[model samples]
Target: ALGIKSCDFQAARNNEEHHTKALSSRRLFVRRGQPFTIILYFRAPVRAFLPALKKVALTAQTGEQPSKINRTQATFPISSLGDRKWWSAVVEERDAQSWTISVTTPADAVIGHYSLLLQVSGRKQLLLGQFTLLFNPWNREDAVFLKNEAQRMEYLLNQNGLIYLGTADCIQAESWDFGQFEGDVIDLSLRLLSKDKQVEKWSQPVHVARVLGALLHFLKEQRVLPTLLNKRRGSVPILRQWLTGRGRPVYDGQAWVLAAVACTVLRCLGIPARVVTTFASAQGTGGRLLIDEYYNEEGLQNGEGQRGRIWIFQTSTECWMTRPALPQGYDGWQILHPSAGSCDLVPVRAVKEGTLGLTPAVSDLFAAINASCVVWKCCEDGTLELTDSNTKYVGNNISTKGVGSDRCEDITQNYKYPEGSLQEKEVLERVEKEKMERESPLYLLLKAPSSLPLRGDAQISVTLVNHSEQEKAVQLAIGVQAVHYNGVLAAKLWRKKLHLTLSANLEKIITIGLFFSNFERNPPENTFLRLTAMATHSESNLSCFAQEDIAICRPHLAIKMPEKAEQYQPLTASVSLQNSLDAPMEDCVISILGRGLIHRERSYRFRSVWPENTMCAKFQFTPTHVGLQRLTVEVDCNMFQNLTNYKSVTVVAPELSA
Candidate 1:
């Protein structure tokens, strides 16, 4: 028996191009579970492969349920005749486009509206065509189907997990202002659902062991199980999960993976969940909680009743959602679940309430967790007193707390040092000296040439001088900003100081060195060296002095060479000097050296009347018949007592073939 199959594709030309049309067009919608044949006609013999079908979905009328259909491709050979006919040939191979695809009814597909997309690519080009499927008998019942459609779309968008506008808030806020309300909802929903299907198919566990194993594997992969989740060495206070690591509550990439796993698990159990975030104190002692709550006030004041709220859920153990142990006093906001349960049972207040404050030194709350130490006590006024003991504590009442000092009255009682050992005394002396030296003057100097552009490893020097009298002891320091020519505060550089006594009208070269490299590129033209002088006396106050305008001279000139040179070539160039007070008749020396050929070398001494005079040299070198050759020339000049100049030139020899 011979069976005949045919199909007619129709697509709308209006703004809703993906929607179905009553008249014939490009899209073809076939009844579910029915077999259909597609025919193509070509004028020339061509090779073709069906590109992967994407965004394949089916929509149902009842509950707006959507499902995907597994698509497969079978390529058949077509006779080299220009005719429109359906033909079958030997099947070379087949692969599933999507797994677990069941689309017998509209509800079995993506409920509401959907499309089947097929991308076709040839040797050098590709084309995409879509077949939209809509509910045939679309009927609006008690608005149940419509509401379900909206809910499913919202759920799908939430699942995709986007960092929109720097927050995990739903796409509603991002889509609302664009006038693309329906389009944004539909697209985001589909995308999220598609991602869910992918993750489920790949990462899901098959058995109980697999599930446990996957959980362990996920934790390990996320690096949150042991290093971040482990309890402290000697603490039984049940440290908050967010206090595990440097006290940073923000989840890293690995934390996100854990969150994804948690979300997937909850979704599998049919529980709706998400991640939420807020700021907490870096002190591990804990602070008032800052919960992000979204609400509509106009609706409430108009007696419209409680409008509902959406709360975010944090997946990583670092953050969880639960109801506040104590009353929030505010009624409109709802505490996010899961997280509320993980928080401590103590009655925590909001940070804005002035009951709790973040430590001044806490820059990153996440990293500070591990370093935080807590001290809690009850005050006389029935208020809870919490303090952070991570570092030295300075009491507001000095008379009552005693003078702040690292020194202990009973030396033998201090565990940091033994009763009377030399090492202990030495350590004590060092600490005391450090404390006393805090009031001493600190000096820093930086120097660079004004005309010569500094490059990496460029020669430079810095000097620290003491202008004090009466053999006074002072601290001298020097520094060089390596990354930037400007003395920016954050630039990395070498900084050091030395203590020395200076006689009246005495000058000391505290530091003298060359900056091997100016690591920064494109240094500013106004770049200069800065010199700072500081004086500190054991019995007096610390004083600072600085010199801002110092210039570095352009000491050396670099030569540029031709790209190609003939074998057995003779290259000659002149060395010149500029920006000096001397005449051209001043004596100078130039050197020429050869490498990679025969290692021949030569040097010439010449004199110039003016500083800007040039001395030329003509040299000849022969290459032993070669494919490629390199020649180098270096020049050095001793211009002043403290300055030396050097330059180099490179030459590439041409191929020598008979």
Candidate 2:
């Protein structure tokens, strides 16, 4: 086989009533300096009789040379299951008692792949298993993979990798299939990928990851159809269905599915993998790391030839794994674009000139992370080339979701810098000093807003401030366009260009409107607004930007309830939902959205409802506590777009009869 299955060779050699059962038949992930432990499953009392295993022999063939572990010097310990009855049923069934075998790899142990052999008296050279034993240097408190207890067990001990589904509401993920690498997945991955490989050797973890990711994408066969279909694609079609083309109608999935499949296939080859979600992620096509915009005489985008999809914010997922062959910083926490090259910017160290080699092979990988783009003031016909290759239309204010916590970890440093940081502007100065800024007029700089207004039809105020002492003539362009959460730009709703003279340390406020009539022009009622306002100092030809991603929700359930209520009393709220369109909606559903002491989301089928008419449904809920209670109503329909609304009710303590 590929690597010795850790538990497959446990035979009854000269058994004095020897019986051993394996919990799993996969290799466990181990680190170079860390000790590895395995508990053999036995159903008989014969485990105590094995005195021969007391002085066990451990041999390894990995790294630059093969080596053996001297128990006395190498800290290998063998003992029975004592006090650790975590799995009590197994302990009770195995009358002999469960035995624990632990092996220590020296700090100087080479970081590579190898199979291990254990020789006991009765068994003729037991092939316990093979392990990659990466050089994981992170301490117990610092490891990125350290999530909840079950995560450690499955991700580190169990050989299966996981991907998140229904993430916003934090639902448990179902087990997905990562096809056997020996079969179609690996073969296809190797055959199809020749252009993206900087190092095409399977021995290297990164190279294998890229091929695996490319393989996953090719298997799923995703065409960037950003538009949502007639129905929501909820069910996961595993890799098995993808392999034989048995997938009913060959459905292509979004980032989550691609990442899930990629992680599954990568883990099949004994590589430790996990899927990471970045709240706001940037992606670039056409060798563009950033987006450059040009407007006509009317301040509208010149012509949409897919300059780039510069979304304000989006939920994107990537895969992470431990690279055994790389140096310290690059070894742990490497990112792979499970849908692309299969891997992270940590490899940028290898792309840096002196460290590894100045390889452009990694250019496509980091293109989104650190992009440089330019804007052109085309007089109807102008040079459509790389004007602003110098960055941050997409990859800004990036954040990583916490593993075992409910918070957004600021991983902006991992991508780029803070929007208005001193160090960030210097990158432009350095590039500008080197004559990188060409055709600088009509260029703009936009910063992604910290927060955006979610609902209501009103405009947002973006204040433009000048920090320089020298007064400069500035022309700022502010635009807000409705875009789909799935990365499709709907239409330009409002755009305005402001021309002003800025004194030293002066601030100017600009308005970008989101009118009720704007939805008529842009058909999407439930969508995110892309906010980009660029400030160009007309004197110095310097441009800066302010960006915001605002989510606009349709008016669905107008929550009507008593302003105040007593605890333990039945409270009733009337939900009046109206369809904004002039036609009947299909599969209309109203749902109660809340997750806490009580959690239930029942999708009710309205069958059909006409537009402009109110459908009244009264919800009766008891007050659980004597405090401010938050409630939400979600409306979903097949024809019309989905809508959600939130409300806060005051739940007061019941008054005592005085």
Candidate 3:
């Protein structure tokens, strides 16, 4: 019997072919449904010739479903005679005490931690090595096959990205560090997958992905979805620490944060995934398919607890796979949203074609990005009148980071048809055409600056037009309320009432100004203000309303860094923020975060910075790897939280030394 000295999995060459070379540092990461080579070094001389029953055997086993012996364990001879459908271990090279073997896994191999055992006939089994098998987006026979190279690089390879926030009119991109390949992320991702028993089919991407959603919720309850974008702390480092038992276990996160983790896990599992942000994302309350808001005659929301509030924006995950569970057209990108208390893998095609009859979760998801809006005006007599109806406002500016670039690309059309298009109108019309079928005699439109100065007065303009043939007497109620990003009212800012008479087809514009002093003492939780204008026709008792959301501006940090830097070289990066408010900002801190450049977030705290003055600081860091590195700067103060800016630097390898 020959004793084995060591073995090489050839991770460098194998990972290059599998596109997982950057995923781990100390383990063999290979894709299933494909073949990989490994070399063995033995202490004693061995012969290549062997009897038919005395050939060496290679055995692979997964911990998951260990009871199912046939499904969980597979064994093959040293050199398979011919092409085989099952696992195959073929001899590639032979020498004295050294040999090379090529191992091929079945297309439907069980995904998890796999241990390899090598044994000679009539000898004790010896543990060779361990490796992880994942879904193969590169293998044509795999369910997770992704055809495009650029998309695979963006979805599976990229380690950093931007999550779009804020309203559609004024979008803000927040930088997120997706260090999926760092540390034990690969193991953590696999550890979670192994615990999932709800889905029995590990080979199917659809089943595995659906199970991932449930596992994520199990990690954290309500915090698994997008909520309170302003309050959620930075996630990547904290999540990594939490996953590896190195950081605080607090576990508070935003939707994008969870989506980022989902992206990391999916990509690590060899499934292509990306984070998507949907602005003006609707939440259907009380099981209703459409989003409804109630307002009183006083122009304020009737109740603060109404469940239907359009989120300013929310982040979700999309996975690429061939949908064997659905019809042919439903294959490509599938949505796995964490909203609506469910984690089913919903087909994007189903949402686009209004075929949400697939599942209640799919219907709920469709409503998130393409629901109708109905505004009800509550009268003094306790009657609820449909005052305003809109088909385009609920979902807008659905976006994701562009492939191979840092820019945000609009993917709204992928979820639904173009706004005002015949297809879009048909989809909504077919679903809830009778909800608000009648048109009002009065038309109201509100216009306000999308971005408002943090310390200045604001003005909102409302235009009222009479569509009736005769003169109309209308009572107008205008109000502004500071509200949360989820539409919860924080404080009533200002209100005004007026009576006006307009002739046929006449339009009137009313300008209302809000002083900075009124609500200065009552700032909203997310710096969001909601303006509403309700018009009631005294003649026909008809009502029409208009509303808009304004985002209070935060000063952005100007980041200056070198366009190019050499690996292992120290470089200087500067960040500056101007205090544009009337009063000085107190307890201000500037924090810098980058994965390859900075292992941990570096924060510099300072006292107060006077208004109209600029605060600047410089950071020195060394590049660890040669690639495009993204550096993020966030300035936090009593006045604002996470006022962020991003800069990308190209780090190149240093010149070789003689």
Candidate 4:
């Protein structure tokens, strides 16, 4: 009896070259446009053993459709011409009982799970086991290829990242656990693609990202949180629960959580993806580019008839790939707004040009980032007056985590031209003409500190510019209230009225202070406060509104760990935070997550910590991989939520340490 006995796919060495060694397993994880070696051991008849066949053909059948005409399936007959541009198999080495075959896949081959078969003349086909194929970012011929090495490393391989939060003026970084290479992430990511109706387009990163984007939008409907893994709360762990049929019905996560999950899935599936944060992001509820806000004469927002609202900040995903469907210049990072179902994966270049007709409902993509904002004052006499109009108020400080570092990089220039520029005006003209504001005698702007300490007062200033030559008598009313991120008022904090006279062509600055005691009783959940000012000219009776958003800074966390650690060696990591509140912090919880060093997050709890007292939690973590890893610590107490910090720990092998 002649039959195939065993085979060695050299998965470790092959995966290492393809940058998939972290996903090491019996099944090979390979990339296209490259060659991998496999050795086959067989037993043959005695007469056939005198001289081996020395030639074997290889056949690859996709998991989805195993037919000859299918684009994903391929057959490579044994030949010396292994240099073909398509799938190929050639015997690189031959012996009496064993043979080594070098397999090469086309650069543009559809990627996914595949089963390889070994065939010899006049013999039955033998299964050579299954392997997963992925896009080759290192290969220039691949559509998903990235030019910069560091960008590929950051966007594709790094399992940890920093997601930005807070307003455009005050940018805050939150350490996020991507966990792309963590246990079973690849399988889970593949399983997610399997559910998509366009499962056949899994090979294309752009299409795959669209499917994931739609999934994010779909997941936004049913929000559920995990109870089993309370400490290890992240997308990868949550995704594991959903794929294994546990947390699908109760998956609770927010914008950043959704962005993190999609980023992990893309990186695990061998695509370069990163999360982006856009501060002062606009949402156009009405299908137009105008975001109308109505405020009463008393400086109170009247939400009865508003077209859109400016969110404090928004988190999204950016995928890198060459767009064959689009022109050449539009092939870099594409924005994927999870909540905007109509605006799936749109190229940043396309959004900048206002050529939003590329996809259905893509005009909203442009409107979200570059919309016209107008503020109207509702007079007591049932009349409306346009007091403020701005083209640069929304979509400021578009940012992402820096390459090979934790610093935030401003990418605002990538999305649109500079404000008030001729180029910008051209785009607006092409898409939607901007409405000119009626000539007004005064200009108003609200300014406040980017952040204020939790225990301190907020000092807000309002500037009024009188452009008229005649002196004007102005009656100003200011109101400050703690607000949620979604523009909802939480609690009124302060109000003041001022009577002043402004000289010709002069600006007036009025500063007000709101004590912390006013908001201590009803603190904002997101630590944001909206300051509104309404000024009415006593003579002309023209009233206007100005509003500013400020953040009451939360407590900070400090992480302490060794600069370098050895692989598979235990080390202690500590996180400390001082209770900034006047009273003790109750039911405090501290969570620590180290992506490659620790498998799951470790959480510690405390009953209470006295005011101004420093509290610390120590963790014993063992490094499992040799690379730079991030250790993140977050604290949640009765007073504050998600106070976080992170530090990088470099892990070295034992041999290298010696």
Per-model root-mean-square deviation over C-alphas: 26.3, 11.8, 3.7, 3.9
Please give the CA lDDT of all the candidate structures: 0.28, 0.46, 0.75, 0.75
Give the worst 10-residue stretch by lDDT in candidate 4. 223-232
Model 2's alpha-carbon lDDT is: 0.46
lDDT of 1 at 85: 25
- Candidate 1 per-residue lDDT, tens place, 1-658, comes to 1111211122333212322222124444432222223332223333232322221112222113322222111122222231112112111222232121222322212221233322223322122233322222122211112224333233212222321111111111100111111222323322333333332221111111123223323333434442122111111011112223333232332232333333333322112223222211122222211111111111001111111111111222111112222344421111111221121111111211211112221211211111122223222354433321113111001010011211112111111234246754564455345435653223334344322223323333434344445566765443333111112222223344667776656555543443424323332222333322333344443333232223334334434445445556765444444424332333455544333333545556665435544545555555443332333343334333112222223344565668
- Range of the 10 consecutive residues with the lowest summed lDDT in candidate 1: 393-402
Error of 4 at 62 (Å): 1.2
Candidate 3 global TM-score: 0.90
In angstroms, the error of model 1 at 325 is 4.7
TM-score of each: 0.20, 0.52, 0.90, 0.89
Local distance difference test, candidate 1: 0.28
lDDT of 2 by residue, 490-599 (tens): 67777777778767777766555655454436545445565666565654534555445565434446789888878878888788876665457777787764322124
- Candidate 2, poorest ten consecutive residues by summed lDDT: 14-23
List, residue by residue over 320-400, the lDDT tens digit for candidate 4. 888888766778888786544532678888888887567654577788888667878877898888775333388889999
Ranking by lDDT: 3, 4, 2, 1
The clash count of every prediction, one per candidate, is 50, 17, 1, 4
